[PDB]
Amino acid sequence: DDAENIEYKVSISGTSVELTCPLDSDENLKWEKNGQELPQKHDKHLVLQDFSEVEDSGYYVCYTPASNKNTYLYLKARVGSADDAKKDAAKKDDAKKDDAKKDGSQTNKAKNLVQVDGSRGDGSVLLTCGLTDKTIKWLKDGSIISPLNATKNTWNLGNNAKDPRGTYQCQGAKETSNPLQVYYRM
């Protein structure tokens, strides 16, 4: 109802990575990284000083005691010598409460079923979804987006080097996943 309701926001600052969680910084807020979890993180924005894709290639999450519902985001990037360019400016658009949510909409069951590809030999990224479903569909910003190479449980994102970058939601036969934040090297 109240507070922000946007997706995770990533921003690299001086070889550091600053992520923004959609949950106020409570005195019990925690973060997670793929398999390991970062405790004592009572901050809304998680910082990653000296980012390393090799040691930091997976997903991320944020949740609080009162908030047992969190979304799994994909964090994968690289930094070096504070590749500080000019990441500034940030307009303000309309974004206060969305539709379909207060009607007991399905959006809880989501541990780690979705997967994505990146190193397929050529360097192509294939986002997989459906969750063991024989049927899978992907949507972008609330609009369906089909591929030009079929949807064999995967999604055509492009050359990991510079292609995958954005949120993508999927819908399986009886299992629909939330907008996956695929943040790859830019």
Side-chain angles (χ1 to χ4, degrees), residues 53-166:
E53 181 240 275
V54 166
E55 281 189 299
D56 307 67
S57 246
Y59 320 70
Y60 271 83
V61 84
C62 165
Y63 72 109
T64 359
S67 163
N68 235 79
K69 59 223 261 77
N70 47 252
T71 309
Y72 256 118
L73 89 89
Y74 217 108
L75 212 195
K76 219 157 135 169
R78 156 157 179 174
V79 297
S81 286
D83 265 323
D84 249 36
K86 206 230 232 266
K87 190 149 218 205
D88 220 341
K91 255 87 114 192
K92 182 114 65 256
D93 303 301
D94 267 43
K96 267 223 293 100
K97 185 205 137 61
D98 219 308
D99 277 69
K101 219 287 172 106
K102 184 158 259 275
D103 216 56
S105 297
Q106 322 312 293
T107 185
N108 189 249
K109 184 71 170 97
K111 257 84 121 190
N112 187 306
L113 302 160
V114 62
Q115 202 162 46
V116 333
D117 251 24
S119 273
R120 271 285 300 183
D122 241 26
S124 193
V125 187
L126 274 160
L127 228 187
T128 24
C129 231
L131 310 329
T132 80
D133 249 333
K134 58 140 137 155
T135 303
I136 331 193
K137 226 134 141 282
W138 235 298
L139 271 67
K140 179 257 280 104
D141 244 306
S143 198
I144 307 188
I145 177 181
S146 233
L148 205 276
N149 51 279
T151 14
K152 56 218 123 217
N153 181 19
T154 52
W155 186 223
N156 185 276
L157 280 168
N159 217 246
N160 47 37
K162 180 204 160 264
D163 272 279
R165 178 257 218 160

Side-chain angles (χ1 to χ4, degrees), residues 5 9-10 18-20 23 36-37 39 44 48 51 61 67 70 96 108 113-114 122 133 158:
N5 318 283
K9 185 240 203 310
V10 205
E18 208 231 305
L19 304 150
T20 337
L23 305 164
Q36 343 198 327
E37 60 278 339
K44 191 243 274 219
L48 333 169
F51 209 44
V61 84
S67 163
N70 47 252
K96 267 223 293 100
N108 189 249
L113 302 160
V114 62
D122 241 26
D133 249 333

